Structure formats: C-alpha cells, structure tokens
Amino acid sequence: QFRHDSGYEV
C-alpha cells in the first residue's frame, strides 16, 4: 500500500 494522504509507501 501507499498512503493516499502523505504518499508514504511500504
């Protein structure tokens, strides 16, 4: 997943 808010990607 990527966070759709911060763009943080696992």
Partner: antibody, heavy 116, light 108 residues
Framework: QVQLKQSGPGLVQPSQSLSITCTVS????????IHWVRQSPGKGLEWLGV???????DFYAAFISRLSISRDISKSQVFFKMNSLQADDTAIYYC??????????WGQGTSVSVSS | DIQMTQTTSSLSASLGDRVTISCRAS??????LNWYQQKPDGTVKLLIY???RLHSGVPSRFSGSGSGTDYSLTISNLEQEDIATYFC?????????FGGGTKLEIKR
C-alpha cells in the same frame, strides 16, 4: 463537512495552459493529499498527480514536464497548472482528497474543452 | 504501472436485481482496491475502500469482495440512483491506476 470547490476555465485555446484552483474546507491541507484526476470521453479516470499532505508533489510520467502543483495552506488552496493543452486534453478535471486508503471526497469537476 | 481492467464496459439490469461489477489487477494488490461512482452529472463519490469497507454515508446495499488480483463490487438490490459509472482503483503501488469503468443501464 468536507468540501472541495474547483474554479477555473471551461475553454482553453490549443497550446495555452489550464489553471484550476481547488479550495477546501472542513479539513487542513497539512493532513490530507489533494489528487488531480481527469475523465475524457471514452476513456476512464486518469491520475495526473498529487500534492501530498507534507507539501511535496508527485506527477504521472506522461505529465512530468507539463504540470505544476502548489498550495497555499493559509487559504486552503491547491493550484493545478497544465501547460500547452491539445485536443486530447479535453476532459472533466477533478481535485480529490486523499485520506489513508483512497480518494474519499471529490471536487465537483471542471469541464475543460480545448478549441480555437 | 499496475494495469486495472474492467472487462465489461456496460451492464444492463432491472431495479431490484443483484449487480456485480468485476475488476482485475495485473499483479497482486493485497486488497488495496477502491471503488468510485461517477453519476451522469459528473459528480464522483468513493463507495468502497480496502476491498470491502464502506465509505461514510454509502448505503450498505454496496459491498465488495476479492483478493490477490481479482475484485468485485456488488449492489445487492439495484436502485435508480445507482445508475452511474463505476471505476476500480488500486491503492497498492504508486502511481494510482484506475479501471476503464462499467456503466449501468436499465434492462427492459
């Protein structure tokens, strides 16, 4: 109540730019991403880029030299600009809020026609 | 990019019918799959996120299922207000990508 309100033109001349402002309310730009998506007739939704919550942008590969996205946190505004529109850029353009998992609240859309 | 495919562009159904819309990803997306509804007036809403979670305010007649590469959105009993176009979107790997859409129409 979460709202995204778009402003910008219905008509762009070919080889001119498109500018759209997304004015948000009921949340802080510092907590959510603002994504830019378009829908062309006979095409689906296409993701163009985003202003992430932290203030950095990401652009889709096909738009890397044509897009500008910036924001004014105090005014709750995100600014979209796309350079040199052509016929295949006629579309409905949206801003949309990004939360943890998805684009959870959308702007009303800006119908952009490219024509001389 | 992860390519998203909605193999059916159009589906016909009667009010009250169970309606299922399919979506496939080109690789495993680990259940990070969202569904959007675009109404004829161009307004878009999130329906379902993370395969099966209902977005706030969305009727529980919408549900979602799947895993790996294959996902679906089901409307349990179809209503007039559901006549719209539905898009899936993978939330697994940047950049975000969408399916081609599935438009509903009324069968008569």
């Amino acid at each position: 109540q979460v709202q995204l309100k778009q402003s910008g033109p219905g008509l762009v001349q070919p080889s001119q730019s498109l500018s759209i402002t997304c004015t948000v309310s009921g949340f802080s730009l510092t907590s959510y991403g603002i994504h830019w998506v378009r829908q062309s007739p006979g095409k689906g939704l296409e993701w163009l880029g985003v202003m992430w919550s932290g203030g950095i942008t990401d652009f889709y590969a096909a738009f890397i030299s044509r897009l500008s996205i910036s924001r004014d946190i105090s005014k709750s505004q995100v600014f979209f600009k796309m350079n040199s529109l052509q016929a295949d850029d006629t579309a409905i353009y949206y801003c949309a809020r990004g939360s943890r998992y998805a684009l959870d609240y959308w702007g009303q859309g800006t119908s952009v026609s490219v024509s001389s | 990019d992860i390519q998203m495919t909605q193999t059916t562009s159009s589906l016909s159904a009667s009010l009250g019918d169970r309606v299922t819309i399919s979506c496939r990803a080109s690789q495993d997306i680990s259940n990070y799959l969202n569904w959007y509804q675009q109404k004829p007036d161009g307004t878009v809403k999130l329906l379902i996120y993370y395969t099966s979670r209902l977005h706030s305010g969305v009727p529980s007649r919408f549900s979602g299922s799947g895993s790996g590469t294959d996902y679906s959105l089901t409307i349990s009993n179809l209503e007039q207000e559901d006549i719209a176009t539905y898009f899936c979107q993978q939330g697994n790997t940047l950049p975000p990508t969408f399916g081609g859409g599935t438009k509903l129409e009324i069968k008569r």
